[PDB]
Design a binder for this molecule. Sequence first.
Ligand code: K
Ligand code: K
Ligand code: K
Lengths: 346, 346, 346, 346
Amino acid sequence: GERVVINISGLRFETQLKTLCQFPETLLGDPKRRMRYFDPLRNEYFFDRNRPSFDAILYYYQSGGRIRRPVNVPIDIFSEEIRFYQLGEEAMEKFREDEGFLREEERPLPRRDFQRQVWLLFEYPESSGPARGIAIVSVLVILISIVIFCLETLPEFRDPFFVVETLCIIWFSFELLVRFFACPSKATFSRNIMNLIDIVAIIPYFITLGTELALAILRVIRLVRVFRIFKLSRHSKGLQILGQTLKASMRELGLLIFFLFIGVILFSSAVYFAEADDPTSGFSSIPDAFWWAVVTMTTVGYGDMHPVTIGGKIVGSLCAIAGVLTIALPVPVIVSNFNYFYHRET
Amino acid sequence: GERVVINISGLRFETQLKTLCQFPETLLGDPKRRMRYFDPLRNEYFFDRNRPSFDAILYYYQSGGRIRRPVNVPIDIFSEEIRFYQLGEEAMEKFREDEGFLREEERPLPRRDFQRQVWLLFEYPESSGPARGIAIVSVLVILISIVIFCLETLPEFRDPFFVVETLCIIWFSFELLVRFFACPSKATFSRNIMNLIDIVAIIPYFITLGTELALAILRVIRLVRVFRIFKLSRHSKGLQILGQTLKASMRELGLLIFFLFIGVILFSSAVYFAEADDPTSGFSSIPDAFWWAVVTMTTVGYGDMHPVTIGGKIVGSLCAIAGVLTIALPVPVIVSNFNYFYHRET
Amino acid sequence: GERVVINISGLRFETQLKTLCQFPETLLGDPKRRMRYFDPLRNEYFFDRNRPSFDAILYYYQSGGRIRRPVNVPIDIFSEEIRFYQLGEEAMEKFREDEGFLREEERPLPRRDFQRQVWLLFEYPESSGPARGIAIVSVLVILISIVIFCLETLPEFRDPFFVVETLCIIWFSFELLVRFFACPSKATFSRNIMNLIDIVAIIPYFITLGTELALAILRVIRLVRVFRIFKLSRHSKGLQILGQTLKASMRELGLLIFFLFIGVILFSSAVYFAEADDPTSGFSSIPDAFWWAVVTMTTVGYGDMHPVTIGGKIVGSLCAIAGVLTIALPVPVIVSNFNYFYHRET
Amino acid sequence: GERVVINISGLRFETQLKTLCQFPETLLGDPKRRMRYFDPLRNEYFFDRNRPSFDAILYYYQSGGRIRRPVNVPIDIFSEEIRFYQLGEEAMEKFREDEGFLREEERPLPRRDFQRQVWLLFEYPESSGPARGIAIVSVLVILISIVIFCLETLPEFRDPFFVVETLCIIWFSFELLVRFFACPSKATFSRNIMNLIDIVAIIPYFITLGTELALAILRVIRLVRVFRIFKLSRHSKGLQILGQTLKASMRELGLLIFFLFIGVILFSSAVYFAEADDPTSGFSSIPDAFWWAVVTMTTVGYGDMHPVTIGGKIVGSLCAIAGVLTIALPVPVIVSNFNYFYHRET
Ligand SMILES: [K+]
Ligand SMILES: [K+]
Ligand SMILES: [K+]
C-alpha cells in the first residue's frame, strides 16, 4: 500500500494504491492507461480537469461504488467528467437513477416483415401518412359514437341510429382484431389498460344483440355504454397524464371524501336543532340537511332551503368557511403529482 | 500545546493539542485509538475519509459541542462519518435534533403477562388476528350508532331504536372499562383526547336514563349526542393529522373569522344606504344585509336579496372581490401546517 | 508592500500589507493587536477559527467594505466571526442590512416624570395593570358603538341611543386629548394613520350637533359614521399587517379591477347577441348583462337571468372559466406580500 | 508546454501554457499584460482577487469557452471578476444569456429630422408634454367609443350617436395614418399586433358606410365592433403581459377545455339515468344536463334543475368535487407564466 498523489489543476488529492485497485476498469484502475498521466520528477499525476468533480469521483472508490453529484456542479459537466474517468455504463446508470430519469425502456417490435408493418401502423402514428390517416379516422369514429349516444336519448326520437351504431362497432372490432393479431407479445396484451377499455367498449352491443335475438340490469348496460369516452386516451396525452395522476393520488382522494362526510354529518346535525323551533324552517330531519351542507361546503350554493333563524345563520356561516378549509387541504398534493407527471415529458 | 497535522485524503487540517483533549471519548480524544492513524515520517495522521465532512467535525471540538451538516453533504454520508469519529450518541442526538426528527419516544407496556396481552390487543391492532377483529367490530358499531342518530330524527318514526342504542352503549362502555383496567399508567389515561371523547360519547345516555327513571337543556343533551363521530379518530390517521393541524393553527382561524366580521359590517353598511332610496329594494336594516354579505363574500352566493339600484351593484361587485382577497390570505399557512404534519409520517 | 501569510486552521491565505492597512480598527489593521497572533518561526499568523468564514472576511478588505455571508455558513456563526475580527458596528450594520432586518428603530419617550407616565399608559398596554384596564375598556366602548350604529338603523325603532352615543363620543374625545397632550413630539402626531382615524371617528357627531343646533350630504355623513370599525386596528395586529399588505399591493389591485372590467364588457357583448333572436331571453341590452357577467366570472353565480339559447350557454361556459383564470393571476403576489409582512414578526 | 502557477490570494492554481494561449485577448492570453502580475523569485503570478471566482474563470480556458457562475457567488461579484480578467464582450454576453436576460434589443428611429419627431411623439409618450397630451386624448377617445357602443344597444333609444361615432373614427384613422407614414421601417408595421388591432377597429364602419350608400353577416359585423377594447393595450402594460401569458400557455388552455368536456359528458350521462325513474325529475335527455354539469363543476351553481332522487344527489356531490379537481390542475402553470412575464419587468 503506497500513497499515490493526483493533482487536479492545482488541487492535490492523496490516496493509497489499494483504493484505486478495487475497480480495474477505471482509468486509474488499470496500471497502463493512468501510467501516461503520471509525471516522474514530482511523482504526481496531472489532470487539467474540473476540481469540484474529482472530489466526488474519489469518493466512488472509497465508498465502493456510491456516486453523487455535488450540488454546485451542473449535471452535464459531471456526466462528461464521469465519461473521462471511464467509471462505466454501470456507474453512469447509478448516477442517472440518482438524478431520477429511469425511463430508458424501449418497447419491442414483431419479428417478421409483414407483422412489424401492421403493428407499426396501428401503434405508431408518427411514422407514415397512412398512420396519421388511421389516427384521424379513429378519432372521428369515436366522436360520432358519442354524438349517437346522446342523440339516442333525446325525447323527440324515442332505424338510422342502429345503422350508425353498428358501423361504429364494426370499426372498433376491426381495429381491435388487427391490433391483437399483429402484437409482438400476446402476454402483454391483457395487461394494457387501453385494450381493456376497447373490449368494454364493444361488449354491451354484442350481449344486447345476443339476448335480444336468442330492467335494472338493462339500466346497468345502458350506463356501461358511456365508457367510449375513454377511447380518446390513446390519442390524447393529457388524459394519460390525468390517469397517472389519479392512480398516484388514491389516499388523498379518500381523505377528501372522508373529510367531506364528517363535515356533512356535523353541520346537518347542527342546523336542524337551531331551526327545529321555527315552523317556517324547511329542515325536517338530519338526513334532510345533507344536500344543504354539501352545496354550502363546496360553494355551489344552490341552497336546498334558506335558514330562517339566527342560530341557523351562524351555523351556515361556519359551514361556508369550513368547507373551504376542508377541501383546500389534500388538493396541493394532487396538483404536485400532476406537475410532476406533466413536466416529466420534457 | 503542540500543533497536530491531520490529512483527510490530501486536504490538510492543523489544530492545537488542547482542542482535541476537550472531548476524550472521540477517536482523536484518546491518545491510543488515534495513535494507530498517526504516521511517524511525516508527523501527520492519514484518514482516507470524505474531505467536506471533516471540516464540520473539526468545528465540533472548536465550538465545544456545536454540530452542523454542510448544505453540500447528504445526511446519511455525514451520519456515517459522525459514527466513524465516535463523537457519541449525545452528539448524534444533537445532529438528529438539528435535522428535525425528535419523535424517538417509545410508549411502555403493562408489567405483567395477563395485562400486557389485554393492552396489546386493544391498543395495538397490527399485532394479531383478534386485534383486527376488534378493530373492524368497533368501526361497525360506531357506524350503526351514527345511522341510528339520524334515523331517530326522521319524521316518519317520531322500540327497536332504544334496543340498538343500548347495545351500542354496552359495547362502548365495555371497551372503555377494558382499556382502562389494562393500561400501564393510569396517570396518562386522563390526558389522552380520545379517552375523553369516549367518556363524552357514553355520558348523555346515562344522564337521560337517570333523570328519566329517577327543554333547552334537553336540546343541549341532544346536540352533545353528535360527538360519536369523533370516535372514528382512533381508527383513522388522516383525522388525527387534521386535529394536529387545527391545534397548530389557532391564530390563523381567529384572523379568518375576524377579517370576515370586519368585511360583513362594512359591506352591509354600504349596500343598505345605496338601496334605501329605492322602494323595490329588500334591504331594510344593516342587520338585514349581514346574510347577503356572508354568502357574497364566500361565493356560495345564495342571495338573501338581489340589489336593485346601480350603487348597490357597484357595492356588490366590490363585496364579491373583497371576500376572495380576505379568505385567501390566512389559508396558505394552514395548508403548510397540514403538509408538514402529513408528510412527517414518511 | 510585503505579502503576509495567515493560516486559518490549515487553510492558508496570502495578502499584501497595504490591503490590511485600509481598515485600522480591525484586529489585522492595528500592528499590535494582530502582533500576538503572529508566529516567528514560520512567519505566519495562526487562527483556530472557521475556514469558510475567513474567505468572506478577506474580501471585505479587498473590496473596500463589501460584506457578504457564504450561502454555506449559518448567520449566527458568521456574526460571531465578524465580532472576533472586530470589523465594527458599521460593517456589522451592513451585514444586518444584507440579511434584511433594518427594523432597529426605537421610538422615544416624553422628557418629564409626569408626561412619560401618561404616554406610557396610553401608548404601552404591556407595562402595567391599569394599562390593560384602559385597553379592555377601550375595546368594549368601540364594540358597543358599532352595536348602536346597526341598532339605530333597525326599523322597529325608527332617547337611549343618543345618550349611549354621546357617552361613547365623550370617551373617544377624552382619550384623544390625553394621547395628544402627552406625546413626546407633536410633529409626528399628524402623520400617524390611527390618530387621523380617531379624528374622523369623532367629527360627524360634532358637525351634526352644530348644524342641528345652529339630503345627499346627510347620506354622506351617515356613511362616514362607519369608520369606527377601524379604531380596532390599534388593538389588533392582524389588521395592521392587513393595512401594510394593502398598501404594498396597489398595482395588483388595479390590475384585478381592470381585468374584471375588460371581461365584463366582452362577455356582456357576446351573450346579448346570441340571445337577441330569442323572445324568451331576458338580456335586453349590453348594460343589462353586466351583473350576469360579474356574478358568473366571480362564481357567486346568482344569475341575473338564465341563458335560454345554445350560443348563450356556450358563452356562459367560457365566462365561468375565464373569470377563474382572470382572478387567479394577480392574487399570489398579494398573498406573498401578506406572508412577508406576517412572518416578519418572528 | 510548461506548467504555470497562479496564486489567487493563497489558493494556488496550476495549468499548462497551451491552455492560456487558446484565448489571446484575455489578460492571461497576451504575454505582456500578465507579465507584470508575474513574480520572479517564486515563479508565480499573484492576484489579490476572489478565490471562488477564479475556479470558474480557469474552466473557461479548459472548456474552450464555457462560462458558469458558482451557485455560491453573487452575479455582480462574478461580473466584475469577468471584466477584470478581460474575457470579452462575447464571454460576458454568454454569461448574461446563462443568467436569462437576453432582452438587450434597441429599436431604431427614423433617419430624418422631421420624421424622427413625429415617430417619437406618437410611439414614445415619456418624452415630452405634447406626447402625454396625445396619450390622454387617445385614452379618452377610446373610452367614449366604448360608452357609445353600449348606449347604442340600449332599448330607450332604438342622430347624435352617428356624429360621435364618426368623430371617433376620424381620430382613429388620423393617428393610424400619422403612425404609418412616420415609421422607420414599413416592413415591421404589418407584423405588430397592435397595428392590426387598429385596422380591425376602423374597418367595419367603412364597410357599413360602403354597402349602405352603394342578416347573420350584419350580426357578425356588429360583434366585430367590440374589438375597440383592445386598443387600450397600447396604454396598459398589464394587458400586454396578459397577452404574452396567454400566448405562452396555449397547451394548458386546451387541456382545461378538454378536461371540462370529458367531465360534462360523464356526469350528464350519470345524472339522467338516476333521475329517469322519477316523474318529478327535470332532466329529460343527456343533452339536457349539460348546463347543469357545467355550472356544478365550475361552482357558479345556478342549477338548471335540482336533483330529486338519492342517486342523483350522490352523482351531484361527486360532480361538485370533480370540477374543483379538474379545474385546479392546469392553472398553476398559467399563473407561473404570469409571474415570470410580470416580474421580468424589474
Ligand atoms: K363558488
Ligand atoms: K355559487
Ligand atoms: K345560486
